[PDB]
């Protein structure tokens, strides 16, 4: 059933699983027309498909051309997500195919179940977790490949960089969700925290800066502080 | 006008014949039901006074043979049997009629209710849903599970309704996932109507049989089947006009007949709200929408 606080360690066991987040698939800017009506303009989007154990990210870029001449795009976006996830699974060798796919939004369950009918032994699950994967497009290098795409493209990343050399999957996921929660709550402040010291850089082959173990503790503390501050403002508490 | 005689009534029982019902007392000199209209299937059904659990009964058609009821004190139920001796049977019925030991099927001349509930129901189709090929009549009860309920456990005692599953390879063409899920027309028209049922009359017959088993026996699997067959039509953008008009009449009489006090357990809120207010056919079931809104506005 649903993935929650109770069954959290299941994410880091040896059964292959993927999270799928569809919140950045269909993206628009809302604007005024010459006549003073409102219209949308689609921008490039992405499916965020993540192995929480390995950090392997399957970023399927959704080019605006897929929406051309289609109706009910927010509905279509869920089905297009399920179509591409199904295509990704079929593209993987059998021993790399997930045993579970966890969708971050309940509206993805039926579309993904119907597209995966050929895979009855792959469990499609919702989650009670409020995961901050919507903030993926606050990671500069992910935002850059999505916006520059001129056609449908899959790009593979490791969202943990080289962290698993030093820390467990559980700890790497916790760091990732804290970084993304901070970027979601106050992007400007989170990005300031991450780049404030010019001597710590991002390797060409990485997404995040090359912090020492001690620097990660300072960074993680600064991210927690950012999140609590923001929360006190949101709620006046 | 045909007759189903009873050998006796040794246990107190409520006896149903179609939409009618009569209380019979323990050892009451009751010897059966006469003046049964020829041309329809019928159901004769029982609920014992001492165990109001297990409603059970028999679907039959008096054109197919001479049927009677006899209590079995070993199995503890009223059983239908066929009398193969025409002259013995005619002589039993004539004696019981002369002694006026029989209730008369109480049909009002103006009243098309039973025809309207059984219009497409055919004994030969019932006998394929309820498999007991040595009898010309079919036993159903409250507890019998469906082939579909059994997949999700004695196969000989199952209701073999046509399996309908909206999230199945049968329902969804590879490459038309979204189209086939949101518009079930290919599943309704190609798979079910052209493929399995062959025509709308056989589809309606099974829908009507499912409803009657739900109503008369509280058979939960039957209720599921009735709603699935309604939802499959209402969820199709493309349905022949004659089928929608006929479905409105079918459902109207079913909703009209349902006991008011059983709407809570026999009507699925989600399906009826979806069918009447959200579905492609939300505006195609005028009679059904009006009777549902006037009789069960709470459910909606």
Short mmCIF file of C-alpha atoms in Angstrom, two decimals:
data_model
loop_
_atom_site.label_atom_id
_atom_site.label_comp_id
_atom_site.label_asym_id
_atom_site.label_seq_id
_atom_site.Cartn_x
_atom_site.Cartn_y
_atom_site.Cartn_z
CA UNK A 1 0.00 0.00 0.00
CA UNK A 2 1.04 3.66 0.64
CA UNK A 3 4.71 4.52 1.41
CA UNK A 4 4.80 6.53 4.73
CA UNK A 5 6.99 7.42 7.80
CA UNK A 6 6.29 3.82 9.13
CA UNK A 7 7.90 1.92 6.15
CA UNK A 8 10.64 4.50 5.29
CA UNK A 9 13.68 2.14 5.47
CA UNK A 10 12.08 0.10 2.61
CA UNK A 11 13.43 2.85 0.25
CA UNK A 12 17.04 1.71 0.94
CA UNK A 13 16.66 -2.08 0.75
CA UNK A 14 17.88 -4.17 -2.25
CA UNK A 15 14.50 -4.32 -4.15
CA UNK A 16 14.88 -1.94 -7.12
CA UNK A 17 12.36 0.92 -6.86
CA UNK A 18 11.77 4.26 -8.51
CA UNK A 19 10.02 7.41 -7.40
CA UNK A 20 8.13 9.21 -10.19
CA UNK A 21 7.28 12.92 -9.81
CA UNK A 22 5.16 14.50 -12.57
CA UNK A 23 4.93 18.06 -11.06
CA UNK A 24 7.31 19.58 -13.65
CA UNK A 25 5.96 17.74 -16.75
CA UNK A 26 3.44 20.38 -17.86
CA UNK A 27 4.77 23.88 -17.13
CA UNK A 28 3.23 27.17 -18.29
CA UNK A 29 3.57 30.95 -17.99
CA UNK A 30 0.12 32.62 -17.69
CA UNK A 31 -0.11 35.97 -19.60
CA UNK A 32 -2.53 38.62 -20.98
CA UNK A 33 -3.50 38.57 -24.70
CA UNK A 34 -3.71 41.75 -26.83
CA UNK A 35 -7.53 41.64 -26.32
CA UNK A 36 -6.99 41.42 -22.49
CA UNK A 37 -7.90 37.69 -22.19
CA UNK A 38 -5.58 35.21 -20.45
CA UNK A 39 -3.52 32.58 -22.28
CA UNK A 40 -0.83 30.07 -21.30
CA UNK A 41 2.52 29.49 -22.99
CA UNK A 42 4.03 26.03 -22.28
CA UNK A 43 7.74 25.76 -21.45
CA UNK A 44 9.88 22.63 -21.48
CA UNK A 45 9.18 20.20 -18.62
CA UNK A 46 10.59 16.99 -17.21
CA UNK A 47 9.67 13.71 -15.54
CA UNK A 48 11.70 13.18 -12.36
CA UNK A 49 12.29 9.42 -12.03
CA UNK A 50 14.66 8.58 -9.18
CA UNK A 51 16.19 5.40 -7.68
CA UNK A 52 16.44 6.49 -3.99
CA UNK A 53 18.98 3.75 -3.20
CA UNK A 54 21.55 4.52 -5.98
CA UNK A 55 20.76 8.19 -6.74
CA UNK A 56 20.28 7.33 -10.43
CA UNK A 57 17.96 9.96 -11.94
CA UNK A 58 16.21 9.36 -15.30
CA UNK A 59 15.34 12.95 -16.32
CA UNK A 60 13.01 12.66 -19.30
CA UNK A 61 12.77 16.13 -20.85
CA UNK A 62 9.23 17.02 -22.07
CA UNK A 63 9.60 19.38 -25.03
CA UNK A 64 6.72 21.84 -25.62
CA UNK A 65 6.11 20.23 -29.08
CA UNK A 66 4.39 17.23 -27.32
CA UNK A 67 1.48 19.59 -26.33
CA UNK A 68 0.95 21.00 -29.86
CA UNK A 69 -2.73 20.67 -30.86
CA UNK A 70 -3.64 18.64 -27.76
CA UNK A 71 -6.55 19.41 -25.38
CA UNK A 72 -6.88 18.95 -21.57
CA UNK A 73 -3.08 19.17 -21.16
CA UNK A 74 -3.01 18.73 -17.33
CA UNK A 75 -4.83 15.37 -17.91
CA UNK A 76 -2.64 14.42 -20.90
CA UNK A 77 0.50 15.24 -18.85
CA UNK A 78 -0.30 12.39 -16.43
CA UNK A 79 -0.78 9.90 -19.30
CA UNK A 80 2.37 11.11 -21.13
CA UNK A 81 4.26 10.66 -17.80
CA UNK A 82 2.92 7.09 -17.49
CA UNK A 83 3.74 6.40 -21.20
CA UNK A 84 7.38 7.56 -20.75
CA UNK A 85 7.86 5.67 -17.41
CA UNK A 86 6.48 2.51 -19.08
CA UNK A 87 8.86 3.08 -22.06
CA UNK A 88 11.83 3.56 -19.62
CA UNK A 89 10.99 0.29 -17.80
CA UNK A 90 10.72 -1.59 -21.12
CA UNK A 91 14.12 -0.08 -22.18
CA UNK A 92 15.86 -1.48 -19.04
CA UNK A 93 17.27 -5.02 -18.90
CA UNK A 94 14.98 -7.32 -16.85
CA UNK A 95 17.44 -7.39 -13.87
CA UNK A 96 17.38 -3.53 -13.77
CA UNK A 97 13.56 -3.16 -13.96
CA UNK A 98 11.97 -1.85 -10.74
CA UNK A 99 9.85 -4.12 -8.50
CA UNK A 100 7.91 -1.01 -7.32
CA UNK A 101 7.21 2.44 -8.70
CA UNK A 102 6.17 5.02 -6.09
CA UNK A 103 4.26 8.03 -7.51
CA UNK A 104 4.51 11.29 -5.56
CA UNK A 105 0.93 12.29 -6.64
CA UNK A 106 -2.12 9.96 -6.33
CA UNK A 107 -3.46 11.21 -9.71
CA UNK A 108 -0.57 9.24 -11.37
CA UNK A 109 -1.81 5.84 -10.05
CA UNK A 110 -4.44 4.96 -12.69
CA UNK A 111 -2.42 6.30 -15.68
CA UNK A 112 0.71 4.39 -14.57
CA UNK A 113 -1.25 1.20 -13.65
CA UNK A 114 -2.92 1.14 -17.13
CA UNK A 115 0.41 1.77 -18.97
CA UNK A 116 2.12 -1.00 -16.92
CA UNK A 117 -0.57 -3.73 -17.46
CA UNK A 118 2.18 -5.80 -19.24
CA UNK A 119 4.13 -5.75 -15.87
CA UNK A 120 1.66 -7.20 -13.34
CA UNK A 121 4.52 -7.98 -10.85
CA UNK A 122 5.60 -4.27 -10.69
CA UNK A 123 3.73 -2.69 -7.73
CA UNK A 124 2.46 0.87 -8.32
CA UNK A 125 2.25 2.67 -4.95
CA UNK A 126 1.28 6.10 -3.67
CA UNK A 127 3.07 7.79 -0.80
CA UNK A 128 1.91 9.75 2.26
CA UNK A 129 5.37 11.47 2.24
CA UNK A 130 5.25 15.16 1.10
CA UNK A 131 8.41 14.92 -1.08
CA UNK A 132 9.95 18.13 -2.41
CA UNK A 133 10.82 16.80 -5.92
CA UNK A 134 8.93 19.77 -7.53
CA UNK A 135 12.08 21.79 -6.56
CA UNK A 136 14.26 19.68 -8.99
CA UNK A 137 14.15 22.63 -11.43
CA UNK A 138 15.93 24.76 -8.72
CA UNK A 139 19.05 22.59 -9.41
CA UNK A 140 20.79 24.82 -11.97
CA UNK A 141 22.23 22.01 -14.14
CA UNK A 142 18.84 20.17 -14.34
CA UNK A 143 17.00 23.46 -15.15
CA UNK A 144 19.68 24.25 -17.83
CA UNK A 145 19.33 20.91 -19.75
CA UNK A 146 15.47 21.15 -19.62
CA UNK A 147 15.31 24.77 -20.92
CA UNK A 148 17.95 24.20 -23.67
CA UNK A 149 16.25 21.02 -25.07
CA UNK A 150 15.05 21.44 -28.70
CA UNK A 151 13.53 17.90 -28.82
CA UNK A 152 12.46 15.07 -26.46
CA UNK A 153 15.60 13.83 -24.65
CA UNK A 154 16.44 11.53 -21.69
CA UNK A 155 19.43 12.70 -19.56
CA UNK A 156 20.90 10.45 -16.82
CA UNK A 157 22.29 11.93 -13.62
CA UNK A 158 23.35 10.77 -10.15
CA UNK A 159 21.45 13.19 -7.87
CA UNK A 160 23.77 12.23 -4.92
CA UNK A 161 27.03 13.06 -6.83
CA UNK A 162 29.72 10.95 -5.05
CA UNK A 163 28.03 11.11 -1.57
CA UNK A 164 27.50 7.29 -1.41
CA UNK A 165 31.34 6.86 -1.23
CA UNK A 166 31.07 8.40 2.29
CA UNK A 167 27.41 8.04 3.51
CA UNK A 168 24.55 5.51 3.32
CA UNK A 169 21.57 5.82 0.91
CA UNK A 170 19.34 6.71 3.91
CA UNK A 171 21.59 9.66 4.81
CA UNK A 172 22.00 10.68 1.12
CA UNK A 173 18.19 10.74 0.61
CA UNK A 174 17.74 12.75 3.86
CA UNK A 175 20.34 15.32 2.60
CA UNK A 176 18.67 15.45 -0.85
CA UNK A 177 15.14 15.95 0.62
CA UNK A 178 16.51 18.66 3.01
CA UNK A 179 18.25 20.52 0.14
CA UNK A 180 15.13 20.28 -2.06
CA UNK A 181 12.77 21.28 0.82
CA UNK A 182 14.99 24.42 1.41
CA UNK A 183 15.08 25.23 -2.36
CA UNK A 184 11.25 24.84 -2.42
CA UNK A 185 10.62 27.07 0.67
CA UNK A 186 13.07 29.93 -0.20
CA UNK A 187 15.05 29.30 -3.41
CA UNK A 188 17.10 32.56 -3.24
CA UNK A 189 18.21 31.88 0.40
CA UNK A 190 18.95 28.16 -0.25
CA UNK A 191 21.12 28.99 -3.33
CA UNK A 192 22.94 31.73 -1.28
CA UNK A 193 23.76 29.13 1.45
CA UNK A 194 25.05 26.64 -1.21
CA UNK A 195 27.40 29.07 -3.11
CA UNK A 196 28.30 31.76 -0.43
CA UNK A 197 31.97 30.48 -0.11
CA UNK A 198 33.52 30.83 -3.62
CA UNK A 199 36.36 28.33 -2.73
CA UNK A 200 33.85 25.36 -2.74
CA UNK A 201 32.92 24.63 -6.36
CA UNK A 202 30.66 22.18 -8.24
CA UNK A 203 32.64 19.60 -10.19
CA UNK A 204 31.81 19.55 -13.95
CA UNK A 205 30.37 15.98 -13.46
CA UNK A 206 28.36 16.95 -10.28
CA UNK A 207 25.15 18.81 -9.40
CA UNK A 208 26.04 20.07 -5.87
CA UNK A 209 29.20 21.61 -4.38
CA UNK A 210 32.20 19.53 -3.20
CA UNK A 211 31.64 20.00 0.59
CA UNK A 212 33.81 18.16 3.11
CA UNK A 213 31.92 16.06 5.73
CA UNK A 214 32.24 19.05 8.20
CA UNK A 215 31.02 21.60 5.60
CA UNK A 216 27.93 19.36 4.88
CA UNK A 217 27.01 19.52 8.62
CA UNK A 218 27.23 23.38 8.52
CA UNK A 219 25.26 23.48 5.20
CA UNK A 220 22.59 21.06 6.51
CA UNK A 221 22.23 23.20 9.70
CA UNK A 222 21.86 26.39 7.56
CA UNK A 223 19.14 24.58 5.48
CA UNK A 224 17.20 23.48 8.63
CA UNK A 225 17.37 27.11 10.00
CA UNK A 226 16.07 28.47 6.61
CA UNK A 227 13.15 26.00 6.69
CA UNK A 228 12.12 26.82 10.34
CA UNK A 229 12.36 30.65 9.86
CA UNK A 230 10.21 30.44 6.68
CA UNK A 231 7.68 28.22 8.58
CA UNK A 232 7.32 30.81 11.44
CA UNK A 233 6.57 33.51 8.81
CA UNK A 234 4.11 31.27 6.79
CA UNK A 235 2.03 30.64 9.99
CA UNK A 236 2.95 33.55 12.40
CA UNK A 237 4.11 31.01 15.11
CA UNK B 1 -51.17 -20.28 -17.39
CA UNK B 2 -48.72 -22.75 -15.75
CA UNK B 3 -48.49 -24.15 -12.21
CA UNK B 4 -45.65 -25.04 -9.82
CA UNK B 5 -47.18 -27.36 -7.22
CA UNK B 6 -45.60 -27.91 -3.77
CA UNK B 7 -45.63 -31.39 -2.19
CA UNK B 8 -46.07 -29.67 1.23
CA UNK B 9 -44.76 -26.78 3.37
CA UNK B 10 -43.18 -28.40 6.46
CA UNK B 11 -41.24 -25.30 7.64
CA UNK B 12 -42.45 -21.72 8.05
CA UNK B 13 -41.08 -19.71 5.09
CA UNK B 14 -41.60 -16.50 3.14
CA UNK B 15 -42.12 -17.60 -0.52
CA UNK B 16 -41.34 -15.17 -3.36
CA UNK B 17 -42.66 -15.55 -6.93
CA UNK B 18 -41.07 -12.80 -9.07
CA UNK B 19 -41.78 -9.44 -7.31
CA UNK B 20 -44.59 -10.97 -5.12
CA UNK B 21 -44.26 -12.74 -1.74
CA UNK B 22 -46.45 -14.68 0.74
CA UNK B 23 -45.80 -15.98 4.30
CA UNK B 24 -46.51 -19.75 4.73
CA UNK B 25 -46.85 -21.23 8.28
CA UNK B 26 -45.17 -24.53 9.43
CA UNK B 27 -47.30 -27.45 8.01
CA UNK B 28 -49.83 -24.98 6.41
CA UNK B 29 -51.81 -26.83 3.68
CA UNK B 30 -50.06 -24.86 0.90
CA UNK B 31 -49.69 -26.75 -2.42
CA UNK B 32 -48.20 -24.18 -4.78
CA UNK B 33 -48.62 -21.32 -7.25
CA UNK B 34 -50.97 -21.32 -10.25
CA UNK B 35 -51.79 -18.89 -13.11
CA UNK B 36 -48.04 -18.21 -13.77
CA UNK B 37 -47.78 -16.15 -16.98
CA UNK B 38 -46.29 -18.03 -19.94
CA UNK B 39 -43.68 -16.16 -22.00
CA UNK B 40 -41.34 -14.95 -19.24
CA UNK B 41 -38.69 -16.51 -17.01
CA UNK B 42 -39.77 -16.62 -13.35
CA UNK B 43 -37.99 -16.98 -10.02
CA UNK B 44 -39.46 -18.78 -7.00
CA UNK B 45 -37.54 -17.83 -3.83
CA UNK B 46 -37.44 -18.64 -0.15
CA UNK B 47 -36.46 -17.16 3.17
CA UNK B 48 -36.95 -19.45 6.15
CA UNK B 49 -38.66 -17.84 9.20
CA UNK B 50 -36.06 -19.43 11.58
CA UNK B 51 -32.91 -18.42 9.58
CA UNK B 52 -33.49 -15.12 7.65
CA UNK B 53 -29.96 -15.81 6.26
CA UNK B 54 -29.60 -17.62 2.88
CA UNK B 55 -32.33 -16.26 0.65
CA UNK B 56 -32.29 -18.90 -2.15
CA UNK B 57 -34.40 -19.74 -5.17
CA UNK B 58 -34.90 -21.12 -8.65
CA UNK B 59 -35.07 -19.53 -12.09
CA UNK B 60 -37.36 -21.48 -14.44
CA UNK B 61 -39.56 -21.20 -17.51
CA UNK B 62 -42.73 -23.42 -17.48
CA UNK B 63 -42.39 -23.86 -21.29
CA UNK B 64 -39.32 -26.09 -20.64
CA UNK B 65 -40.98 -28.71 -18.38
CA UNK B 66 -43.25 -29.45 -15.42
CA UNK B 67 -41.58 -28.16 -12.21
CA UNK B 68 -42.58 -28.65 -8.57
CA UNK B 69 -41.17 -27.81 -5.12
CA UNK B 70 -40.56 -30.40 -2.40
CA UNK B 71 -38.93 -29.78 1.00
CA UNK B 72 -35.80 -31.93 1.67
CA UNK B 73 -35.51 -32.44 5.48
CA UNK B 74 -31.88 -33.64 5.04
CA UNK B 75 -30.50 -30.59 3.12
CA UNK B 76 -33.04 -28.35 4.92
CA UNK B 77 -34.37 -26.53 1.89
CA UNK B 78 -37.22 -26.32 -0.57
CA UNK B 79 -35.93 -27.93 -3.81
CA UNK B 80 -37.19 -27.56 -7.36
CA UNK B 81 -37.59 -30.81 -9.26
CA UNK B 82 -38.89 -31.77 -12.74
CA UNK B 83 -41.80 -34.26 -13.07
CA UNK B 84 -41.19 -36.21 -16.35
CA UNK B 85 -44.67 -37.97 -16.14
CA UNK B 86 -47.04 -35.38 -17.76
CA UNK B 87 -50.21 -37.28 -16.67
CA UNK B 88 -49.07 -37.70 -13.01
CA UNK B 89 -48.23 -33.93 -12.94
CA UNK B 90 -51.54 -32.76 -14.61
CA UNK B 91 -53.41 -34.99 -12.08
CA UNK B 92 -51.50 -33.54 -9.06
CA UNK B 93 -52.18 -29.93 -10.23
CA UNK B 94 -55.92 -30.59 -11.02
CA UNK B 95 -56.45 -32.11 -7.45
CA UNK B 96 -54.68 -29.16 -5.67
CA UNK B 97 -56.61 -26.59 -7.79
CA UNK B 98 -59.95 -28.36 -7.03
CA UNK B 99 -59.08 -28.20 -3.28
CA UNK B 100 -57.99 -24.48 -3.78
CA UNK B 101 -54.69 -25.20 -2.02
CA UNK B 102 -52.78 -22.88 -4.46
CA UNK B 103 -52.03 -19.14 -4.46
CA UNK B 104 -52.68 -17.36 -7.75
CA UNK B 105 -49.83 -15.42 -9.37
CA UNK B 106 -51.30 -11.97 -8.51
CA UNK B 107 -50.66 -10.08 -11.77
CA UNK B 108 -52.67 -6.81 -12.28
CA UNK B 109 -53.72 -6.68 -16.02
CA UNK B 110 -52.27 -3.07 -16.46
CA UNK B 111 -48.94 -4.10 -14.89
CA UNK B 112 -45.92 -4.71 -17.16
CA UNK B 113 -43.39 -4.66 -14.25
CA UNK B 114 -42.22 -8.26 -14.63
CA UNK B 115 -41.93 -8.07 -18.47
CA UNK B 116 -40.03 -4.77 -18.03
CA UNK B 117 -37.55 -6.40 -15.57
CA UNK B 118 -37.03 -9.61 -17.67
CA UNK B 119 -37.39 -8.26 -21.25
CA UNK B 120 -33.96 -9.60 -22.40
CA UNK B 121 -33.60 -12.43 -19.83
CA UNK B 122 -33.63 -15.90 -21.46
CA UNK B 123 -33.49 -19.23 -19.59
CA UNK B 124 -30.77 -20.52 -22.00
CA UNK B 125 -28.51 -17.55 -20.95
CA UNK B 126 -29.25 -18.06 -17.20
CA UNK B 127 -28.18 -21.75 -17.59
CA UNK B 128 -24.72 -20.60 -18.93
CA UNK B 129 -24.23 -18.15 -16.00
CA UNK B 130 -25.51 -20.81 -13.50
CA UNK B 131 -24.00 -24.19 -14.61
CA UNK B 132 -26.02 -27.31 -13.56
CA UNK B 133 -26.74 -28.90 -16.93
CA UNK B 134 -28.78 -31.90 -15.56
CA UNK B 135 -31.59 -29.46 -14.49
CA UNK B 136 -33.68 -27.12 -16.73
CA UNK B 137 -34.02 -24.64 -13.81
CA UNK B 138 -31.23 -22.67 -12.03
CA UNK B 139 -30.51 -22.37 -8.27
CA UNK B 140 -29.17 -19.04 -6.92
CA UNK B 141 -28.63 -17.93 -3.32
CA UNK B 142 -27.34 -14.97 -1.24
CA UNK B 143 -23.82 -16.48 -0.80
CA UNK B 144 -22.84 -17.68 -4.34
CA UNK B 145 -19.70 -15.86 -5.53
CA UNK B 146 -18.92 -14.82 -9.09
CA UNK B 147 -16.05 -16.08 -11.32
CA UNK B 148 -14.58 -12.51 -10.91
CA UNK B 149 -14.93 -12.54 -7.06
CA UNK B 150 -13.20 -16.03 -7.07
CA UNK B 151 -10.12 -14.75 -9.08
CA UNK B 152 -9.50 -11.93 -6.46
CA UNK B 153 -13.72 -20.73 -4.36
CA UNK B 154 -15.88 -23.84 -5.37
CA UNK B 155 -16.23 -23.37 -9.19
CA UNK B 156 -19.39 -25.63 -9.56
CA UNK B 157 -21.42 -23.18 -7.32
CA UNK B 158 -20.24 -19.92 -9.08
CA UNK B 159 -22.10 -17.23 -11.01
CA UNK B 160 -20.31 -17.17 -14.41
CA UNK B 161 -21.10 -13.53 -15.24
CA UNK B 162 -18.96 -12.04 -18.05
CA UNK B 163 -15.78 -10.61 -16.42
CA UNK B 164 -15.57 -6.79 -16.82
CA UNK B 165 -12.37 -5.14 -15.58
CA UNK B 166 -11.62 -1.52 -16.62
CA UNK B 167 -7.85 -1.99 -15.83
CA UNK B 168 -7.22 -5.17 -17.84
CA UNK B 169 -5.46 -5.88 -21.15
CA UNK B 170 -8.94 -6.93 -22.45
CA UNK B 171 -10.22 -3.35 -21.78
CA UNK B 172 -7.14 -1.42 -23.02
CA UNK B 173 -5.51 -1.65 -26.49
CA UNK B 174 -1.69 -1.30 -26.38
CA UNK B 175 -1.00 2.27 -27.59
CA UNK B 176 -4.55 3.50 -26.77
CA UNK B 177 -4.12 3.45 -22.95
CA UNK B 178 -5.47 6.96 -22.21
CA UNK B 179 -8.07 6.84 -25.01
CA UNK B 180 -9.48 3.40 -23.97
CA UNK B 181 -9.43 4.20 -20.21
CA UNK B 182 -11.27 7.53 -20.52
CA UNK B 183 -13.63 6.37 -23.36
CA UNK B 184 -14.63 2.70 -22.97
CA UNK B 185 -16.38 2.53 -26.45
CA UNK B 186 -13.90 -0.01 -27.96
CA UNK B 187 -14.29 -2.25 -24.82
CA UNK B 188 -18.15 -1.91 -24.98
CA UNK B 189 -18.67 -2.15 -28.78
CA UNK B 190 -15.79 -4.37 -30.11
CA UNK B 191 -14.76 -6.57 -27.14
CA UNK B 192 -18.08 -7.00 -25.27
CA UNK B 193 -20.94 -6.39 -27.81
CA UNK B 194 -19.39 -7.70 -31.12
CA UNK B 195 -16.93 -10.10 -29.35
CA UNK B 196 -18.55 -11.83 -26.35
CA UNK B 197 -22.29 -11.00 -26.11
CA UNK B 198 -22.79 -10.89 -29.96
CA UNK B 199 -25.69 -8.36 -29.51
CA UNK B 200 -27.13 -5.74 -27.06
CA UNK B 201 -30.07 -8.09 -26.18
CA UNK B 202 -27.67 -10.66 -24.58
CA UNK B 203 -25.79 -7.80 -22.77
CA UNK B 204 -29.09 -6.41 -21.38
CA UNK B 205 -30.25 -9.96 -20.44
CA UNK B 206 -27.14 -10.46 -18.25
CA UNK B 207 -27.47 -6.92 -16.78
CA UNK B 208 -31.17 -7.61 -15.93
CA UNK B 209 -30.36 -11.08 -14.46
CA UNK B 210 -27.55 -9.56 -12.33
CA UNK B 211 -29.94 -6.93 -10.95
CA UNK B 212 -32.68 -9.47 -10.12
CA UNK B 213 -30.15 -11.74 -8.26
CA UNK B 214 -28.93 -8.64 -6.35
CA UNK B 215 -32.50 -7.60 -5.43
CA UNK B 216 -34.07 -10.99 -4.66
CA UNK B 217 -31.09 -12.72 -2.94
CA UNK B 218 -28.91 -9.77 -1.74
CA UNK B 219 -26.21 -11.41 -3.88
CA UNK B 220 -23.29 -8.96 -3.57
CA UNK B 221 -21.36 -10.24 -6.67
CA UNK B 222 -24.53 -9.77 -8.75
CA UNK B 223 -24.82 -6.15 -7.57
CA UNK B 224 -21.16 -5.60 -8.59
CA UNK B 225 -21.88 -7.08 -12.06
CA UNK B 226 -25.06 -4.94 -12.54
CA UNK B 227 -23.15 -1.74 -11.71
CA UNK B 228 -20.12 -2.72 -13.90
CA UNK B 229 -22.42 -3.29 -16.93
CA UNK B 230 -24.13 0.12 -16.34
CA UNK B 231 -20.78 1.90 -15.87
CA UNK B 232 -19.31 0.30 -19.06
CA UNK B 233 -22.16 1.83 -21.15
CA UNK B 234 -22.23 5.23 -19.37
CA UNK B 235 -18.36 5.47 -19.69
CA UNK B 236 -18.51 4.99 -23.52
CA UNK B 237 -18.76 8.17 -25.69
CA UNK B 238 -20.09 6.04 -28.64
CA UNK B 239 -23.16 3.90 -27.91
CA UNK B 240 -25.93 3.04 -30.40
CA UNK B 241 -28.97 5.38 -29.79
CA UNK B 242 -31.37 2.37 -29.40
CA UNK B 243 -29.12 0.95 -26.63
CA UNK B 244 -29.17 4.22 -24.60
CA UNK B 245 -32.97 4.54 -24.96
CA UNK B 246 -33.40 0.86 -23.96
CA UNK B 247 -30.94 1.22 -21.01
CA UNK B 248 -32.97 4.21 -19.67
CA UNK B 249 -36.16 2.02 -19.68
CA UNK B 250 -34.33 -0.97 -18.11
CA UNK B 251 -32.86 1.09 -15.25
CA UNK B 252 -36.09 3.04 -14.67
CA UNK B 253 -38.06 -0.17 -13.94
CA UNK B 254 -35.18 -1.57 -11.78
CA UNK B 255 -35.03 1.63 -9.69
CA UNK B 256 -38.87 1.71 -9.57
CA UNK B 257 -39.04 -1.91 -8.24
CA UNK B 258 -36.12 -1.72 -5.70
CA UNK B 259 -37.40 -1.76 -2.07
CA UNK B 260 -36.95 1.85 -0.78
CA UNK B 261 -35.28 0.51 2.45
CA UNK B 262 -32.49 -1.41 0.45
CA UNK B 263 -31.14 1.59 -1.61
CA UNK B 264 -28.31 1.93 1.05
CA UNK B 265 -26.81 -1.58 0.27
CA UNK B 266 -28.02 -2.22 -3.39
CA UNK B 267 -26.99 1.15 -5.00
CA UNK B 268 -23.33 2.20 -5.45
CA UNK B 269 -23.10 6.01 -4.83
CA UNK B 270 -19.95 6.42 -7.01
CA UNK B 271 -21.33 4.59 -10.06
CA UNK B 272 -24.76 6.35 -10.03
CA UNK B 273 -23.27 9.85 -9.42
CA UNK B 274 -20.68 9.23 -12.20
CA UNK B 275 -23.32 7.73 -14.61
CA UNK B 276 -26.02 10.45 -14.14
CA UNK B 277 -23.83 13.58 -13.63
CA UNK B 278 -20.21 13.11 -15.06
CA UNK B 279 -20.28 10.35 -17.75
CA UNK B 280 -20.62 10.74 -21.55
CA UNK B 281 -24.25 9.56 -21.10
CA UNK B 282 -25.04 12.02 -18.19
CA UNK B 283 -27.84 13.51 -20.41
CA UNK B 284 -29.02 10.23 -22.10
CA UNK B 285 -30.92 8.60 -19.14
CA UNK B 286 -33.81 11.06 -18.61
CA UNK B 287 -36.30 8.58 -17.08
CA UNK B 288 -33.65 7.01 -14.80
CA UNK B 289 -32.31 10.43 -13.65
CA UNK B 290 -35.87 11.62 -12.82
CA UNK B 291 -36.85 8.48 -10.82
CA UNK B 292 -33.46 8.41 -9.00
CA UNK B 293 -33.68 12.17 -8.09
CA UNK B 294 -37.31 11.75 -6.78
CA UNK B 295 -36.85 8.38 -4.98
CA UNK B 296 -33.17 8.49 -3.76
CA UNK B 297 -31.95 12.15 -3.67
CA UNK B 298 -29.79 11.29 -0.54
CA UNK B 299 -27.57 8.81 -2.51
CA UNK B 300 -26.96 11.65 -5.04
#
